[PDB]
Amino acid sequence: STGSATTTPIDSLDDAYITPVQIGTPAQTLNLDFDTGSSDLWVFSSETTASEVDGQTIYTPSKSTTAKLLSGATWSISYGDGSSSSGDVYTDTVSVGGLTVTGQAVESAKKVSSSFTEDSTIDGLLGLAFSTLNTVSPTQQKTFFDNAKASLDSPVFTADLGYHAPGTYNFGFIDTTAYTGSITYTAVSTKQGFWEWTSTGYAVGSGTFKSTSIDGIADTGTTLLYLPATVVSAYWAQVSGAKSSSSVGGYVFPCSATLPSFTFGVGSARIVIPGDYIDFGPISTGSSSCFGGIQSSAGIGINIFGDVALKAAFVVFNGATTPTLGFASK
Numbered sequence: 646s647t648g649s650a651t652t653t654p655i656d657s658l659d660d661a662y663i664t665p666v667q668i669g670t671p672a673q674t675l676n677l678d679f680d681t682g683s684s685d686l687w688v689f690s691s692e693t694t695a696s697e698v699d700g701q702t703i704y705t706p707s708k709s710t711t712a713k714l715l716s717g718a719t720w721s722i723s724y725g726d727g728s729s730s731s732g733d734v735y736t737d738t739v740s741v742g743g744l745t746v747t748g749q750a751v752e753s754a755k756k757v758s759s760s761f762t763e764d765s766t767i768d769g770l771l772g773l774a775f776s777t778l779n780t781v782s783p784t785q786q787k788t789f790f791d792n793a794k795a796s797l798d799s800p801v802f803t804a805d806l807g808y809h810a811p812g813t814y815n816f817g818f819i820d821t822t823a824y825t826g827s828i829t830y831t832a833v834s835t836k837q838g839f840w841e842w843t844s845t846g847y848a849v850g851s852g853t854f855k856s857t858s859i860d861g862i863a864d865t866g867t868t869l870l871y872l873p874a875t876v877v878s879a880y881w882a883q884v885s886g887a888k889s890s891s892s893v894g895g896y897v898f899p900c901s902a903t904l905p906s907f908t909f910g911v912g913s914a915r916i917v918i919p920g921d922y923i924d925f926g927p928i929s930t931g932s933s934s935c936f937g938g939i940q941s942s943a944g945i946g947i948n949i950f951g952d953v954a955l956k957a958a959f960v961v962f963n964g965a966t967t968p969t970l971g972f973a974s975k
């Protein structure tokens with residue numbers, strides 16, 4: 646089997662991407678944030694505290710003939726940005742882009758933090774990291790990908806995120822029309838439950854490539870590219886008037902600037918992030934200070950190749966016995 650779904654930016658900045666997911670019988674379609682940096686599929690629901698719902702579409706298990714309470718199971722998750730959610734668990738049929746899993750754990754939110762309530766466009770998350778990170782207790786649950794894997798034509802999914810445009814998540818096949826050149830594969834460590842890999846270095850604009858190992862994760866659920874402070878300072882030093890602002894919480898730059906590209910290494914291959922991808926617009930409405938898309942990972946304890954980096958590539962998440970990541974230009 647295979648599945649193929651379109652993923653759509655939630656706003657004009659590509660702050661996140663939503664993908665429609667069918668849950669239950671008859672189908673309830675919710676727009677989920679597919680997150681390769683976490684392992685819970687959780688949704689706004691009929692159980693969510695009413696004051697914490699503001700425009701999201703909810704899953705109502707009582708209206709699904711295939712929903713069953715997973716008795717005694719609870720979940721609670723905290724993300725890198727300080728947001729959180731928790732609740733109880735149902736199993737139900739879940740389909741993505743025509744690929745169906747029966748008996749998927751659907752984590753129903755009883756509580757969500759303010760950042761979720763305030764984002765009316767995201768109805769929940771679908772985690773695609775390794776199932777060792779799933780938070781269901783006392784019986785850990787599998788991801789949608791892990792439950793689908795054995796049925797797929799190939800044990801892979803791909804992320805093809807758009808810059809200010811829709812993109813695609815495919816399950817079970819490589820679309821050889823979706824990228825240019827060849828796919829370069831690189832090793833993955835699953836030790837922390839992430840798609841953790843080592844970049845071979847970077848370049849700023851038309852500058853020379855610096856060969857250096859940068860360990861980080863491929864995380865579709867993180868907007869920005871978080872890299873070591875040395876790398877980030879070298880980038881922003883090429884932008885006149887850029888500075889790190891403790892008040893704003895990262896590097897800002899004049900909205901009048903033209904940003905340089907940023908290149909990262911994948912083995913002997915190179916992925917180029919155009920400058921425009923690094924512009925996250927005014928820090929507040931009408932400001933002439935703009936927020937940068939490349940930020941320091943110092944204090945986060947890991948480097949994160951988030952959407953700014955991943956949307957410059959066709960990315961293969963290879964879930965074979967020995968997982969690997971692939972990157973191609975597009």
Ligand code: NA
Pocket residue numbers: none
């Ligand atoms: Na922000």
